Symmetry: C3
Subunit: 240 residues, 3 copies
């Protein structure tokens, strides 16, 4: 249970899944998307569906995750998926830093004119101003982002969860890891640890608006995400 073990999970999940994807997003005949922009939106859907698949395998390799009861595993993923994805876009969008580019990967990105065009420039802006900019301003490193993402995953306050204690414990061990990293690498500002945590509330708020947009444009599967997560979990991992 170390930052290194958490890093390994992220990295391996990102390279061993190939093109496998959890198809939750997709444009159907009831989507509020103009016909001329279906190709574009569906491309965005394929990207997210692949990151979702990877996310599941990521959690599968996270310390203790596979041990909590399956029902708990499903709830944890349902509660943190959007925040985990947005944290990754915030980090990839640090390369080209009012910001004009939002990266989902290293080779797939949007300019602000397209957001404005799609009518989602407000969420485009706060992602870059409230997360990317402040992370850069803080000199956030890859190790600190991994810690923040784990803190998110290990959430014991979700309704319905069985193993709250076990989950809170994992979270606290990540706190300890994060603080040590702070102590070791940034002994000069004792306020760093707290500042890094301040990004979490902004991540949650932005993440909630994203979900609202998803429901509004109706590009989600009729099948409940819970089922999709449960099915991948009950299945073996890909060749990796």
């Amino acid at each position: 249970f170390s930052i290194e073990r958490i890093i390994e999970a992220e990295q391996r999940a990102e390279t061993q899944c190939g093109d496998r994807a959890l198809t939750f997003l997709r444009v159907g005949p009831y989507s509020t998307v103009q016909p001329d922009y279906k190709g574009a939106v569906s491309a965005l859907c394929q990207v997210v569906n692949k990151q979702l698949f990877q996310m599941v395998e990521y959690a599968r390799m996270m310390p203790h995750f596979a041990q909590v009861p399956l029902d708990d595993q499903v709830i944890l993923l349902k509660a943190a998926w959007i925040e985990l994805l947005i944290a990754n876009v915030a980090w990839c969008s640090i390369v080209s830093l009012q910001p004009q580019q939002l990266f989902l990967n290293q080779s797939f990105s949007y300019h602000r004119n397209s957001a404005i065009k799609a009518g989602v420039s407000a969420i485009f802006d706060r992602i870059l101003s409230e997360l990317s900019v402040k992370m850069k301003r803080l000199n956030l490193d890859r190790r600190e982002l991994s810690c923040l993402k784990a803190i998110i995953l290990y959430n014991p306050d979700i309704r319905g969860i069985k193993s709250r204690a076990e989950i809170e414990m994992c979270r606290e061990k990540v706190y300890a890891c994060l603080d040590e990293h702070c102590r070791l690498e940034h002994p000069g500002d004792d306020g760093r640890f707290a500042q890094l945590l301040l990004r979490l509330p902004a991540l949650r708020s932005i993440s909630l608006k994203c979900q609202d947009h998803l429901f509004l444009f109706r590009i989600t599967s009729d099948r409940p995400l819970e089922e999709l997560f449960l099915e991948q979990l009950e299945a073996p991992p890909p060749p990796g």
Copy 2:
């Protein structure tokens, strides 16, 4: 901490205590019992008092139970005893499937409960527990898990080591779920369904307790003391 380490505790407690008994149930002079049946009721008392003694030795062997302060060990037993006993009878009565078993031999017929007024309890034990357990194909490992979950209860007033107790319960959850994923690849809803029996066990168990303080067949000494005394004492064989 494994379904098998919990199984070992139950099994050993059931065979190594002999006829040793924790005397809580008793038929005395002030007891509201039909002298025409005092013998019968006192026989029921002896059975329960032996299962109570066994229960204490069971808990003594459960992972970490003997580590929390003694006051907490006493509170845990006082809160779970009836539910633990009734879980064992519900499991046994599955065999009959109007007969309720307390042992793998000692039983009681419907017509026996209608007499003492406890026909309601009799009915729901078989109705909500035995039948549904059978219907679910409940196995011994799962009953052991349900009973452990009951024992490790952190929400009781007065408890000191809540975190440890909860941590214990959660490890049993992890064991129960695994058992499911392995011996029931299918139905992902099994785990939760099994847990649904707990509320129905608690409710029935509370009724049984109200029907005890109503027959005056309990000791003048508070059960807490009896538990404390057996705990502060050594075990029977090993």
Copy 3:
């Protein structure tokens, strides 16, 4: 994580820090203190500032204390310090059973407290803590357990690692229970009685705080900072 481990921390922190101090108490220019009584009060300040330094090193050595985030470490020390100091004076003063001891040799007579206007605190420390501890035959090892229970407080606002801290407190409970029923038999109610001293300690401790602020003999710098700075620095030889 046993009593021997907790005792070692206290003892070593008490002898390896030499004359170092964390200057939280000072007779500043804004102290409502009368000029004539400055040397005496400042002497009291130096004593407390040395015990504060030692306290930090004590915590730094306590099981798991150092791995939780600094911020939590800071909050724990800020909430516990006064109670930890007063627990030590209660124990010391036991010898005079008149006099209130801060050390095995630093002490005050009721008259001193009389003219300083703090005879109220003076009396309940000896009365509610020292006397009752003596009356209970409280031993050093046990005083260590009570002090750990105090340190490991998970209910403070702002704390991050509540679970881990609670787990630490509960392990001390088990230690205290084990010790208590082994060296002070003849009373299963001892454990609960020993814990009753905590609320008294907290109440008295809150009043002591009130006197500090009223008089204004505290540093212009927030104690949080002073704790954070000693924690972030290396320990003395130890």
